[PDB]
Amino acid sequence: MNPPPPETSNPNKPKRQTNQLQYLLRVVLKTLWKHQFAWPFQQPVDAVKLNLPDYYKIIKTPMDMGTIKKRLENNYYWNAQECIQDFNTMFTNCYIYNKPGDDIVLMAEALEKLFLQKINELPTE
Ligand SMILES: CC(=O)c1c(C)[nH]c(-c2nc3cc(N4CCN(C)CC4)ccc3[nH]2)c1C
Numbered sequence: 001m002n003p004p005p006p007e008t009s010n011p012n013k014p015k016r017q018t019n020q021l022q023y024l025l026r027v028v029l030k031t032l033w034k035h036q037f038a039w040p041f042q043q044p045v046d047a048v049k050l051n052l053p054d055y056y057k058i059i060k061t062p063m064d065m066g067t068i069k070k071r072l073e074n075n076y077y078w079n080a081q082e083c084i085q086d087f088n089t090m091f092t093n094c095y096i097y098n099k100p101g102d103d104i105v106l107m108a109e110a111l112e113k114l115f116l117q118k119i120n121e122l123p124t125e
Helices: 019-033 065-073 080-097 103-119
Strands: none
Touching (some): 019 080, 019 103
């Protein structure tokens, strides 16, 4: 069964737009989105659809790139590090829920490498 998805707006949280956050949307996210292994990560895990009734019994800080995309579009983040932490949560959830060698984990590892490659150098202020 499904909990509510992570919030993509929060009127009590301050917003910010920075060159690094613009980069994270326009280049990092939008490039990862097009990768052949991106599709498991483009939306929150639907435990009912996927017949994974235990997913949210294990994963208590769920995150996906669709949520991150909407957060970036809504200037939800204060800085790039906050956004990068959401990516890191998404990858780590996949490693927690699954086990090494699983097909989904191979997909997450490949995307994580590409993600790190792209955030190695960010624009300046
Ligand atoms: C448990 C785990 O780590 C995991 C993650 C992070 N994701 C998925 C997953 N995500 C999916 C997305 C689809 N879709 C098919 C339809 N298409 C248009 C887009 C949506 C189908 C099956 C999926 N399985 C699993 C099993």
